PDB file of C-alpha atoms and ligand atoms in Angstrom:
ATOM      1  CA  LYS Y   1      12.735 -19.750  12.981  1.00 31.11           C
ATOM      2  CA  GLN Y   2      10.536 -19.339   9.881  1.00 29.91           C
ATOM      3  CA  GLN Y   3      10.342 -16.000  10.586  1.00 29.44           C
ATOM      4  CA  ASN Y   4       6.707 -16.081   8.265  1.00 29.85           C
ATOM      5  CA  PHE Y   5       5.184 -12.228   8.047  1.00 25.79           C
ATOM      6  CA  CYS Y   6       3.262 -10.394   6.534  1.00 22.48           C
ATOM      7  CA  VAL Y   7       2.146  -6.672   4.374  1.00 21.75           C
ATOM      8  CA  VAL Y   8      -0.283  -4.779   5.730  1.00 21.85           C
ATOM      9  CA  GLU Y   9      -1.171  -1.830   3.182  1.00 22.11           C
ATOM     10  CA  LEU Y  10      -2.018   1.509   5.287  1.00 28.53           C
ATOM     11  CA  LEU Y  11      -4.360   3.371   4.145  1.00 27.93           C
ATOM     12  CA  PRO Y  12      -4.346   7.672   3.705  1.00 27.60           C
ATOM     13  CA  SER Y  13      -6.782   8.127   6.191  1.00 28.10           C
ATOM     14  CA  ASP Y  14      -4.676   5.845   8.562  1.00 30.69           C
ATOM     15  CA  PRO Y  15      -2.861   8.123  11.295  1.00 30.49           C
ATOM     16  CA  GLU Y  16       0.309   6.069  11.138  1.00 26.81           C
ATOM     17  CA  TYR Y  17       0.453   6.898   7.458  1.00 26.17           C
ATOM     18  CA  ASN Y  18       0.489  10.258   8.298  1.00 26.94           C
ATOM     19  CA  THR Y  19       3.216  10.092  10.764  1.00 26.10           C
ATOM     20  CA  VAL Y  20       6.090   7.926   8.712  1.00 26.76           C
ATOM     21  CA  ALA Y  21       4.391  10.380   5.397  1.00 29.03           C
ATOM     22  CA  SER Y  22       4.997  13.194   7.887  1.00 32.07           C
ATOM     23  CA  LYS Y  23       8.824  12.046   8.594  1.00 30.41           C
ATOM     24  CA  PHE Y  24       9.684  11.071   5.256  1.00 32.30           C
ATOM     25  CA  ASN Y  25       8.334  14.984   3.866  1.00 31.44           C
ATOM     26  CA  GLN Y  26      11.226  16.167   5.876  1.00 32.07           C
ATOM     27  CA  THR Y  27      13.526  16.072   3.019  1.00 32.30           C
ATOM     28  CA  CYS Y  28      11.293  14.359  -0.115  1.00 28.52           C
ATOM     29  CA  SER Y  29       8.009  16.382  -0.469  1.00 30.38           C
ATOM     30  CA  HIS Y  30       8.919  16.656  -4.321  1.00 31.28           C
ATOM     31  CA  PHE Y  31       8.505  12.895  -4.363  1.00 34.23           C
ATOM     32  CA  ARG Y  32       4.980  11.047  -4.752  1.00 30.07           C
ATOM     33  CA  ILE Y  33       4.086   8.643  -2.251  1.00 30.05           C
ATOM     34  CA  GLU Y  34       2.304   5.582  -3.659  1.00 30.94           C
ATOM     35  CA  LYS Y  35       1.355   3.552  -0.687  1.00 30.76           C
ATOM     36  CA  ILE Y  36       3.175   2.978   2.826  1.00 30.29           C
ATOM     37  CA  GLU Y  37       2.778  -0.792   4.247  1.00 30.89           C
ATOM     38  CA  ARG Y  38       3.691  -2.112   7.536  1.00 29.25           C
ATOM     39  CA  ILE Y  39       5.876  -5.354   8.033  1.00 28.52           C
ATOM     40  CA  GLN Y  40       4.545  -7.718  10.815  1.00 25.33           C
ATOM     41  CA  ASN Y  41       7.244 -10.690  11.653  1.00 26.42           C
ATOM     42  CA  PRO Y  42       6.155 -11.836  14.991  1.00 24.29           C
ATOM     43  CA  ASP Y  43       9.858 -14.156  15.351  1.00 26.02           C
ATOM     44  CA  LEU Y  44      11.831 -11.160  13.720  1.00 22.78           C
ATOM     45  CA  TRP Y  45       9.856  -8.956  16.101  1.00 21.83           C
ATOM     46  CA  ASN Y  46      10.445 -10.886  19.176  1.00 25.50           C
ATOM     47  CA  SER Y  47      14.188 -11.415  18.185  1.00 28.99           C
ATOM     48  CA  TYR Y  48      14.229  -7.431  17.772  1.00 26.91           C
ATOM     49  CA  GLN Y  49      12.850  -6.903  21.422  1.00 25.58           C
ATOM     50  CA  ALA Y  50      14.961  -9.929  22.969  1.00 25.30           C
ATOM     51  CA  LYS Y  51      18.038  -7.456  21.880  1.00 24.92           C
ATOM     52  CA  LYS Y  52      16.459  -3.859  22.944  1.00 24.60           C
ATOM     53  CA  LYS Y  53      16.136  -5.403  26.626  1.00 24.47           C
ATOM     54  CA  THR Y  54      20.045  -6.667  26.950  1.00 23.66           C
ATOM     55  CA  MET Y  55      20.722  -3.125  25.351  1.00 25.41           C
ATOM     56  CA  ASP Y  56      18.133  -1.496  27.454  1.00 25.28           C
ATOM     57  CA  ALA Y  57      20.173  -3.014  30.552  1.00 27.20           C
ATOM     58  CA  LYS Y  58      23.337  -2.076  29.389  1.00 31.11           C
ATOM     59  CA  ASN Y  59      23.682   1.821  28.060  1.00 27.71           C
ATOM     60  CA  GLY Y  60      22.208   3.018  31.029  1.00 25.59           C
ATOM     61  CA  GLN Y  61      20.408   6.881  30.355  1.00 27.64           C
ATOM     62  CA  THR Y  62      21.430   6.510  26.286  1.00 28.86           C
ATOM     63  CA  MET Y  63      18.209   6.100  24.063  1.00 30.03           C
ATOM     64  CA  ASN Y  64      19.204   3.047  22.029  1.00 33.08           C
ATOM     65  CA  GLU Y  65      16.628   3.113  19.590  1.00 34.22           C
ATOM     66  CA  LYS Y  66      16.268   5.721  16.391  1.00 33.22           C
ATOM     67  CA  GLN Y  67      13.803   5.392  13.355  1.00 32.68           C
ATOM     68  CA  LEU Y  68      16.083   5.681  10.562  1.00 29.50           C
ATOM     69  CA  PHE Y  69      15.673   5.188   6.379  1.00 30.22           C
ATOM     70  CA  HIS Y  70      17.115   2.782   4.237  1.00 29.76           C
ATOM     71  CA  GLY Y  71      16.853   1.961   0.113  1.00 28.74           C
ATOM     72  CA  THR Y  72      17.080  -0.855  -1.647  1.00 26.95           C
ATOM     73  CA  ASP Y  73      15.855  -2.463  -4.685  1.00 31.37           C
ATOM     74  CA  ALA Y  74      12.409  -4.184  -5.717  1.00 29.18           C
ATOM     75  CA  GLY Y  75      14.092  -7.662  -5.771  1.00 28.00           C
ATOM     76  CA  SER Y  76      15.284  -7.598  -2.006  1.00 31.85           C
ATOM     77  CA  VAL Y  77      11.836  -6.736  -0.292  1.00 29.86           C
ATOM     78  CA  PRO Y  78      10.961 -10.244   0.474  1.00 29.42           C
ATOM     79  CA  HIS Y  79      14.490 -11.255   1.676  1.00 30.12           C
ATOM     80  CA  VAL Y  80      14.066  -7.854   4.274  1.00 30.04           C
ATOM     81  CA  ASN Y  81      10.345  -8.703   5.007  1.00 30.01           C
ATOM     82  CA  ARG Y  82      11.323 -12.331   6.268  1.00 26.98           C
ATOM     83  CA  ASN Y  83      15.030 -12.281   7.270  1.00 25.55           C
ATOM     84  CA  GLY Y  84      15.764  -8.064   7.866  1.00 21.94           C
ATOM     85  CA  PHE Y  85      18.867  -6.829   7.438  1.00 19.97           C
ATOM     86  CA  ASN Y  86      20.850 -10.255   8.139  1.00 22.85           C
ATOM     87  CA  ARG Y  87      24.817 -11.155   7.741  1.00 23.73           C
ATOM     88  CA  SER Y  88      24.761 -11.761   3.435  1.00 23.91           C
ATOM     89  CA  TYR Y  89      22.683  -8.622   2.951  1.00 23.54           C
ATOM     90  CA  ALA Y  90      25.662  -6.641   3.946  1.00 20.76           C
ATOM     91  CA  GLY Y  91      27.635  -7.875   1.134  1.00 19.24           C
ATOM     92  CA  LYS Y  92      25.579  -5.685  -1.143  1.00 19.61           C
ATOM     93  CA  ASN Y  93      26.224  -2.533   0.898  1.00 16.41           C
ATOM     94  CA  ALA Y  94      29.014   0.350   0.569  1.00 17.59           C
ATOM     95  CA  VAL Y  95      32.169  -0.484   2.928  1.00 14.82           C
ATOM     96  CA  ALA Y  96      33.350   2.916   3.571  1.00  9.39           C
ATOM     97  CA  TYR Y  97      32.930   2.847   7.111  1.00  7.54           C
ATOM     98  CA  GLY Y  98      32.541  -1.215   7.535  1.00  9.04           C
ATOM     99  CA  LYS Y  99      30.714  -4.525   6.103  1.00 10.30           C
ATOM    100  CA  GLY Y 100      27.235  -3.797   7.849  1.00 12.82           C
ATOM    101  CA  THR Y 101      23.911  -2.673   6.571  1.00 12.45           C
ATOM    102  CA  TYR Y 102      23.726   1.272   6.415  1.00 13.50           C
ATOM    103  CA  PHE Y 103      21.197   3.353   8.102  1.00 11.62           C
ATOM    104  CA  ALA Y 104      20.588   7.200   7.076  1.00 11.35           C
ATOM    105  CA  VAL Y 105      18.890  10.428   9.474  1.00 11.90           C
ATOM    106  CA  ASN Y 106      17.451  11.522   6.776  1.00 11.84           C
ATOM    107  CA  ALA Y 107      15.062   9.952   3.667  1.00 11.79           C
ATOM    108  CA  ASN Y 108      16.932  12.499   0.802  1.00  9.54           C
ATOM    109  CA  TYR Y 109      20.299  10.217   1.140  1.00 11.14           C
ATOM    110  CA  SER Y 110      18.159   6.427   1.001  1.00 12.52           C
ATOM    111  CA  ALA Y 111      16.148   8.391  -2.018  1.00 13.03           C
ATOM    112  CA  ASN Y 112      19.602   8.071  -4.563  1.00 11.88           C
ATOM    113  CA  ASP Y 113      19.429   5.390  -6.946  1.00 14.52           C
ATOM    114  CA  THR Y 114      22.257   3.719  -6.411  1.00 15.27           C
ATOM    115  CA  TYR Y 115      20.318   2.701  -2.732  1.00 13.80           C
ATOM    116  CA  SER Y 116      16.675   2.768  -3.982  1.00 14.74           C
ATOM    117  CA  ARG Y 117      17.139   1.443  -7.397  1.00 14.42           C
ATOM    118  CA  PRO Y 118      14.054   2.125  -9.628  1.00 14.10           C
ATOM    119  CA  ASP Y 119      12.242  -0.882 -11.027  1.00 12.33           C
ATOM    120  CA  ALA Y 120      10.804  -1.934 -14.450  1.00 15.85           C
ATOM    121  CA  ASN Y 121       7.736   0.830 -13.721  1.00 13.04           C
ATOM    122  CA  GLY Y 122       9.978   3.665 -12.458  1.00 11.62           C
ATOM    123  CA  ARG Y 123       9.208   2.579  -8.723  1.00  8.30           C
ATOM    124  CA  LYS Y 124      11.724   3.588  -6.131  1.00  8.21           C
ATOM    125  CA  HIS Y 125      11.758   2.061  -2.296  1.00  8.62           C
ATOM    126  CA  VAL Y 126      12.503   2.648   1.319  1.00 11.61           C
ATOM    127  CA  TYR Y 127      11.983   1.138   4.578  1.00  9.32           C
ATOM    128  CA  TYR Y 128      11.035   3.241   7.593  1.00  7.43           C
ATOM    129  CA  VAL Y 129      13.285   1.206   9.915  1.00  6.86           C
ATOM    130  CA  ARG Y 130      13.740   0.786  14.113  1.00  5.04           C
ATOM    131  CA  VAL Y 131      17.506   0.444  14.839  1.00  7.37           C
ATOM    132  CA  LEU Y 132      19.551  -0.123  17.945  1.00  6.29           C
ATOM    133  CA  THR Y 133      21.974   2.821  17.563  1.00  9.78           C
ATOM    134  CA  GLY Y 134      22.290   2.897  21.224  1.00  6.49           C
ATOM    135  CA  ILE Y 135      25.988   3.941  22.206  1.00  5.71           C
ATOM    136  CA  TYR Y 136      28.416   4.482  18.965  1.00  8.17           C
ATOM    137  CA  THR Y 137      31.684   5.956  17.151  1.00 10.73           C
ATOM    138  CA  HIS Y 138      33.262   7.290  14.032  1.00  9.79           C
ATOM    139  CA  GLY Y 139      33.542   4.610  11.917  1.00  8.13           C
ATOM    140  CA  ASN Y 140      35.808   3.025   8.756  1.00  8.79           C
ATOM    141  CA  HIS Y 141      36.175   0.526   6.027  1.00 11.25           C
ATOM    142  CA  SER Y 142      38.232  -2.389   7.087  1.00 10.87           C
ATOM    143  CA  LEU Y 143      35.316  -3.135  10.296  1.00 12.40           C
ATOM    144  CA  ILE Y 144      33.518  -6.523  10.179  1.00 11.71           C
ATOM    145  CA  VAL Y 145      32.367  -5.520  13.957  1.00 10.09           C
ATOM    146  CA  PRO Y 146      31.955  -2.953  15.759  1.00 10.29           C
ATOM    147  CA  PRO Y 147      35.368  -1.237  17.351  1.00 12.58           C
ATOM    148  CA  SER Y 148      35.747  -1.770  21.142  1.00 11.39           C
ATOM    149  CA  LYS Y 149      34.382   0.687  23.697  1.00 11.73           C
ATOM    150  CA  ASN Y 150      36.877   0.074  26.060  1.00  7.25           C
ATOM    151  CA  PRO Y 151      40.708  -1.506  25.204  1.00 10.03           C
ATOM    152  CA  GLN Y 152      40.844  -3.167  28.935  1.00 13.28           C
ATOM    153  CA  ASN Y 153      37.450  -4.426  27.621  1.00 11.87           C
ATOM    154  CA  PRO Y 154      37.639  -5.375  24.765  1.00  8.20           C
ATOM    155  CA  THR Y 155      34.946  -7.795  24.411  1.00  7.98           C
ATOM    156  CA  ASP Y 156      32.106  -5.168  24.907  1.00  8.33           C
ATOM    157  CA  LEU Y 157      31.767  -3.741  21.617  1.00  6.83           C
ATOM    158  CA  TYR Y 158      30.279  -0.380  20.558  1.00  6.61           C
ATOM    159  CA  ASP Y 159      26.167  -0.957  19.290  1.00  7.22           C
ATOM    160  CA  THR Y 160      26.871   1.386  15.838  1.00 10.20           C
ATOM    161  CA  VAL Y 161      29.502   3.615  14.050  1.00 15.20           C
ATOM    162  CA  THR Y 162      28.228   6.384  12.627  1.00 16.82           C
ATOM    163  CA  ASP Y 163      29.930   9.686   9.913  1.00 16.78           C
ATOM    164  CA  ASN Y 164      29.851  11.825  12.538  1.00 17.33           C
ATOM    165  CA  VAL Y 165      29.522  11.255  15.932  1.00 18.04           C
ATOM    166  CA  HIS Y 166      28.034  14.845  16.616  1.00 18.50           C
ATOM    167  CA  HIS Y 167      26.240  15.151  14.053  1.00 18.58           C
ATOM    168  CA  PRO Y 168      25.096  12.118  12.312  1.00 18.56           C
ATOM    169  CA  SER Y 169      24.097  11.483   8.603  1.00 17.17           C
ATOM    170  CA  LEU Y 170      24.288   7.539   8.223  1.00 19.77           C
ATOM    171  CA  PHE Y 171      24.933   5.048  10.872  1.00 17.65           C
ATOM    172  CA  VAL Y 172      26.539   1.239  10.332  1.00 17.03           C
ATOM    173  CA  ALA Y 173      24.693  -1.986  12.565  1.00 14.88           C
ATOM    174  CA  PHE Y 174      26.892  -4.902  11.858  1.00 14.81           C
ATOM    175  CA  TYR Y 175      24.529  -7.844  14.211  1.00 15.23           C
ATOM    176  CA  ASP Y 176      21.344  -9.421  13.089  1.00 19.68           C
ATOM    177  CA  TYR Y 177      17.907  -8.506  14.708  1.00 19.37           C
ATOM    178  CA  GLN Y 178      19.709  -5.137  15.333  1.00 19.16           C
ATOM    179  CA  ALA Y 179      17.261  -3.592  13.612  1.00 16.37           C
ATOM    180  CA  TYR Y 180      13.497  -3.973  11.872  1.00 14.12           C
ATOM    181  CA  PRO Y 181      11.952  -3.217   8.783  1.00 12.83           C
ATOM    182  CA  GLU Y 182       8.577  -2.039  10.068  1.00 11.85           C
ATOM    183  CA  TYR Y 183       7.770   0.410   6.990  1.00 10.56           C
ATOM    184  CA  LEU Y 184       7.702   0.001   3.127  1.00  9.77           C
ATOM    185  CA  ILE Y 185       7.289   3.363   1.634  1.00  5.61           C
ATOM    186  CA  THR Y 186       7.069   2.915  -2.486  1.00  5.06           C
ATOM    187  CA  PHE Y 187       7.327   6.548  -4.487  1.00  6.15           C
ATOM    188  CA  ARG Y 188       8.568   7.856  -8.053  1.00  3.16           C
ATOM    189  CA  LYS Y 189       9.915  11.355  -9.243  1.00  3.65           C
TER     190      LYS Y 189
HETATM  191  O1  XBA G 201      19.377   3.818   1.683  1.00  3.63           O
HETATM  192  C1  XBA G 201      20.569   2.994   1.913  1.00  3.63           C
HETATM  193  N1  XBA G 201      20.859   1.979   1.356  1.00  3.63           N
HETATM  194  C2  XBA G 201      21.473   1.081   1.506  1.00  3.63           C
HETATM  195  C3  XBA G 201      21.228  -0.217   1.321  1.00  3.63           C
HETATM  196  S1  XBA G 201      21.620  -0.121  -1.029  1.00  3.63           S
HETATM  197  C4  XBA G 201      21.313  -1.565  -2.004  1.00  3.63           C
HETATM  198  C5  XBA G 201      21.306  -1.420  -2.953  1.00  3.63           C
HETATM  199  C6  XBA G 201      20.064  -2.771  -3.668  1.00  3.63           C
HETATM  200  C7  XBA G 201      21.361  -3.746  -3.396  1.00  3.63           C
HETATM  201  O2  XBA G 201      20.714  -5.452  -4.042  1.00  3.63           O
HETATM  202  C8  XBA G 201      21.293  -4.473  -2.084  1.00  3.63           C
HETATM  203  C9  XBA G 201      22.053  -3.125  -1.417  1.00  3.63           C
HETATM  204  N2  XBA G 201      22.660   1.522   1.170  1.00  3.63           N
HETATM  205  C10 XBA G 201      23.618   2.655   1.775  1.00  3.63           C
HETATM  206  C11 XBA G 201      24.082   3.298   2.347  1.00  3.63           C
HETATM  207  C12 XBA G 201      24.722   4.026   2.250  1.00  3.63           C
HETATM  208  O3  XBA G 201      25.496   5.090   3.024  1.00  3.63           O
HETATM  209  C13 XBA G 201      26.738   4.906   2.046  1.00  3.63           C
HETATM  210  C14 XBA G 201      27.759   5.304   2.287  1.00  3.63           C
HETATM  211  C15 XBA G 201      28.608   6.133   2.958  1.00  3.63           C
HETATM  212  C16 XBA G 201      29.319   5.238   2.632  1.00  3.63           C
HETATM  213  C17 XBA G 201      23.084   5.480   3.444  1.00  3.63           C
HETATM  214  C18 XBA G 201      22.234   5.097   2.557  1.00  3.63           C
HETATM  215  F1  XBA G 201      21.193   5.752   2.956  1.00  3.63           F
HETATM  216  C19 XBA G 201      21.819   3.162   2.223  1.00  3.63           C
END
């Protein structure tokens, strides 16, 4: 309920560092990583996994989880560490595809100064998030919850909406506890 948390700094010699860095560096090799931190919020983690369980019973053969990037301002880090991507933080996200939290497949998307806004020290922030993309469709700005999969059973909704169903670039999650901010990357130009 209180959703307290811990910030563990990974040594660059830690395997975990090599993995997160490896993925980041697919599109952001010209940037300079200063630290990667793991975020441990047991309440949030339990909450996240609770949803993952009920989604893994519904979507049959679908791989519901993805690891996607999300940039934000220095001044949002404590709110996200504690609360995740709850409903108040979606008021500060684009509406082009709906009113939820936006997650990019590639780290260069998030590495934009609109999203990973450089701080007073010129340091930029991008989370490497676990997100339940599940079953998804094309999106639009007017949405506040995802569209109905079945018009004949419209209380069963899509999990997320994307820019492009067959070749996605970003994903929009609308529900609380549908993403876990596992890793935080800190870097400069
Ligand atoms: O990484 C992202 N972070 C974010 C959060 S921005 C953050 C900036 C400081 C503010 O206080 C909180 C909100 N939004 C995004 C949106 C995206 O798509 C928006 C266009 C398709 C319409 C793609 C992205 F990669 C991202």
